[PDB]
Amino acid sequence: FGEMERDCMIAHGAAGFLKERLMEASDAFRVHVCGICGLMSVIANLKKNQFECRSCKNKTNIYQLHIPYAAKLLFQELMAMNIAPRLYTERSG
Amino acid sequence: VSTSTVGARRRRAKQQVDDEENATLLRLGPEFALKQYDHDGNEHDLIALSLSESRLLIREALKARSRARNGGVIDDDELAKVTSGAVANGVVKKTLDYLNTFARFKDEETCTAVDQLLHLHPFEIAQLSSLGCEDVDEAITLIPSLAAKKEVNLQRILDELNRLEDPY
Amino acid sequence: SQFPYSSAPLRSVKEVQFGLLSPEEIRAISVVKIEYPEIMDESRQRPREGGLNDPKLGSIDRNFKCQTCGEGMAECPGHFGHMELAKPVFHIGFIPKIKKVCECICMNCGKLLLDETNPTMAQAIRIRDPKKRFNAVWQLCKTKMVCEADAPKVVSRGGCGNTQPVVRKDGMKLWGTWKKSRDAQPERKLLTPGEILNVFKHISPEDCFRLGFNEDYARPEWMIITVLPVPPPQVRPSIAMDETTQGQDDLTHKLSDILKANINVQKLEMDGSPQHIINEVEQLLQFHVATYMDNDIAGQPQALQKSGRPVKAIRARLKGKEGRLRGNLMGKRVDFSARTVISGDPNLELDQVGVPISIAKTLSYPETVTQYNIHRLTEYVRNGPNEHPGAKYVIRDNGDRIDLRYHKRAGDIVLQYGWKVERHLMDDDPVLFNRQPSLHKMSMMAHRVKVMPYSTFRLNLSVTSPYNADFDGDEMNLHVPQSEETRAELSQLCAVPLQIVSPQSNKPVMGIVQDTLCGVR
Amino acid sequence: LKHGTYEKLDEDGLIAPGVRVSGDDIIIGKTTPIPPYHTKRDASTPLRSTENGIVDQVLLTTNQEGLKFVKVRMRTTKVPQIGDKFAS
Amino acid sequence: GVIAAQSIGEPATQMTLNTFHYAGVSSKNVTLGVPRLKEILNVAKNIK
Amino acid sequence: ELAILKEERTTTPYLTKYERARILGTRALQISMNAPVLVDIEGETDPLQIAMKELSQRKIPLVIRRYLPDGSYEDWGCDELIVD
Amino acid sequence: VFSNNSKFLVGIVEYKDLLRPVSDVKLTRGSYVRVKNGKFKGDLAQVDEVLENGLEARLKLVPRLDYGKDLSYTSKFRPAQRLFSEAEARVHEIRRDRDGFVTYGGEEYYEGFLYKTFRLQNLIVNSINPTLNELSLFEVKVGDTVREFTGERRQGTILHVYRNFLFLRSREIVENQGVFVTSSNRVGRDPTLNKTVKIRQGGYKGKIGIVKEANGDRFRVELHNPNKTIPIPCSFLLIESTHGWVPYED
Amino acid sequence: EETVEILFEAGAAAELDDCRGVSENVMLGQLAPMGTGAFDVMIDEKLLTSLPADYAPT
């Protein structure tokens, strides 16, 4: 699904079809992130229902996200080169 | 899960160390501070509740809830039944008996009297309305926050809170 | 709905924040230490508590639940490690910036040379965006030849009154030259990373602002490497070769070599030290840390593999047409696709297509069981996955999947409200239809399906003008929708009749071609 | 083990000519011994997943070193239809 | 924007890549077709 | 806070094609998972056909919230946008 | 020699250090070493004794044996480690030499351990790291690990369980203390598949096939004649058996 | 074009990126604000006061 077909489905305007073609019908993934530090380094456990972000001692302010796996791999390598991307869920001007 | 009104307080370059709770030094954490905000963002003060206004206002809201659920048609435990679930049944039950057997006042009229008396920090404002004291040393030993204020007039506050205090 | 249930409120990304990493941060987020170069335990399977496979890391086996988090191999995102160092080293991607900063400031007491008493400086303090700010600053502080121990009655800014050397670059090393005082002899020593660390660890915060950085995200002494992260083996997979042989992805061998060089750098400066044996091995460690993030370092030969091929440094997984940002995010690979050869047919209507029987019985469509269609889905579930018209998988609500192939006795199925049915592709579904390479926005159009035998697609010939297509052996592609929203968007936006007039030139595109034209004349 | 039927092999592991083979029919069963019951691992060689042919000729001889060495030759017939290409 | 970039990017892929014409005259030089468009979208500070 | 009242609304009163598309899609997605349908259901069973049949007679209960460029917005009812 | 004009000058003050002749020289009886060669490569061993000359050391090793099971070794194909069992050797395949000492296949085993000589250069004496495995080798709530919530004894093991308190035991302080219970924080599928078939009804009558899949009532026969597998009812098939083509009574 | 050096220039400069273009919101898998996506669909209530009272949310 080349970049040019992406440009065409932008030319038509079907944003939902694109959000589909680049998610469900390929590689969806889920990541639990913190809200103070802003990194994908949350230690989570589900059938016990408990979370922990040891970099800030935070067991309350955590949010889950739906991203492709390739973005997870990308950001893990960028962190592996000491360049940190931080993701926040609310604007602040 | 259930939030409130306060956000922001964002992390900076430092970590503040005056963050622990101490009710003897007026440290109530970042939740019951001095200046709060309502459901719209307007600047509000803190509303601390002492015993008398506590019981009276609980009776008010829960009686308007009883008559309200009755379409428009009095006791502690029966009024705690208007709620839902069992947590408010037990907890609100022992809360109504608790705040019931210590009522320094049982009327909204003398509640208006002391409401004229009190109005000063809202916590210690509701604490002057809270603990019934004898002399001044009790008022400063129970509340060590009235030290560095230099504004007494507390003896007649005790003579009015005690002179008006209805008998139990 | 693929995912197990959690309890964290669902949101979305709004603002992305970039910034350098600090060492103590890496010491905090990491959950294990790296020490031992050998990969295996001691030939007894598993790993070596301390090696580059410690099961605290990434667990990619059928049964080993990730000991750190506890999940399987489908929920663990991996966990970072951290390797120590016995010496700080440069970062190959920042050298010219460290050069400029080692020019702008003092070389002792650590203070910004020019001050706001200079009108050019006094107006250079003000700019908003940092890059043009530091352009305006470095435009000036490249010529201040003394850390004035005074201000321009004597006022002392706090400077040390020392002269200033000149810094230059060769390969991966910075040279410092002191032209002493008309001209007395220069001395060109080597600014080792430890010195520059000690110097940058003194800059006041307001100069960390004036230099264009930020006190809580870009701190200059963070640019010089001290501790090192170790990515989880979800990033470094190990292939299985002839089933009984397995090599290691490059980053494993490279991290192992860096650790070898670390254990080498320890010993020499702990006892017998012939001086010219210390700086050489340390320079080798700098070389490893350099070729861990860049292979085409202009200036020095590429670090080869064991078999003599250049190593895939991290810098190359990303850039390029076949890396990450061109190859797995802008244009990834999709499902529910179809590729086959075209063929002409003059007995269709303008927006139809002819799907073979096999492509129809392979592709599918999820449908919701309601009250208006339960009968048709009873017939479809009865007709099985090997006869048209029939259905395939049946999906219940929690996440299970009944497969009507292996499920011998399927006559006992009763359909509850809310389930889904992956039926076949049938008549009148709107499918997207595409040819490479697409140029103007008319090369992707949604047609209506029509099932036909044989092995080729079908087109009405009047749609051979936007596709630039002809039946002399070409191929095209069919994409299938899934949910209802996207079907609505296809039928209401990407149809054929709504594309007859082109916005390129205010004139149509589809007309009469070939025999129909000659014989209508 | 792999999935396709193993019932078309004779006893030494080589399918005989004259047998019809279709989708993923195993034609050469070969085993690799496990490095030290249930002590061997399969290393077969299946027919391609998109072919339907009659086995034609099987060859069995030795290699260079001194071990066995097998080849198989399948064949099939093809007929023109809607889609095949032609040229003058 | 995309519709404009395409509606200009499409008549380009079918235009002379050397054009010639006035080719039999050395006193008259002119750049047309591709090379000219490339010398336009680049703002080349030296034309032909 | 940033909303515009029901007298100062200055955006065009015509249902554009993108809006129509998302209305039909979402309403169909609701009609599918057993939701009350607000017309006389007769000889069509496809949810998209039912949604268009509703949009023809104007019974769809939804609210368009057009975000203006700088941060404000406007709220239009789907039963006063003049369907072309 | 590298042709580049790379020679460098040494300072006079650096000369003697260039000629320093030399204290690892370690290895003591009773200590552990790691073997560097053979099937025991990587294994921990105790130094039992050294040769008079001073070259090879006798090591006490957990054996890796098969008791001659497949006789008529390499490191890659070595056996698991397990103490020598002389009765197993007696049963399966042995010379008694002393109390608890047997020579088995020309190696000596004393109280279950191999004693074998190795060159000192074939053992590692420095920086050995014992493994997890080597460390292993060389009233309901009562017993569970609880971690104080508002006390001062971290964790501890619940020794007693009352109604208002719980006698917990510390790990570092090793002292039994009572704490509130709530205060403590608990921390084939058918017989005709693949069998040859003849079809007796339908458009495929007289054609050979094989039952590829017979889930139920509707079978899938792989026709021999064209490369296609068809759906056919099981009533339409004859199966081959001991005597001729039998119907579905086989 | 020129990726890693731009990511360094932004990494050591604390450039806050803010999510408004199409490329960003697509390469994270979200609804890109374009055509279909420039508004929202709030569930109604005034016209819910038109349903028969029986369909109610119990």
Add this chain to the structure above:
Amino acid sequence: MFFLKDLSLILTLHPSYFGPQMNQYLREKLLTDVEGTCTGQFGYIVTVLDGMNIDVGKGRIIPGSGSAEFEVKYRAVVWKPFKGEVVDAIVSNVSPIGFFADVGPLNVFVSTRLIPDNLVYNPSNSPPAYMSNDELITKGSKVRLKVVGTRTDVNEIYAIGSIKEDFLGAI
């Protein structure tokens, strides 16, 4: 400490329950959830002020799911402990390791080491109590204590106090 906290809860409503009585079911689930729970950020939320007039507003139909998002804005009479807070209590249980004292919504444990040496646990007395001269602490006695410890189990909090000081004892 008791307060009047302004809380807003996000109720994500399902499309099927879009009946003619939305706001009613909204208040139903709201007051099924919030009323009584413990939050380490705001303790035990007791009772909401004014429950039948809460402006729930309108809901953003979450793009891609079909559900609704409601931002309920209410006001309650919450409680929250703090370290060093002097509060009253009514005990509920006595034990050789300390006594339990209900401070309204919760129960506070007081260990023996935080009890003056004069108060001696008397199992023989019926009912059992902590006894001394001119002093008596039995089940149901008014106790004046000081909150010196708070633990957050996310679900519920657990406080500890003492009465080995001045003006803390039996009143």
Add this chain to the structure above:
RNA sequence: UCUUUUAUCGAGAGGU
């Protein structure tokens, strides 16, 4: 009642 495996790097020959 499911499920069910296709290395890797590189080179070349091709089709629109």
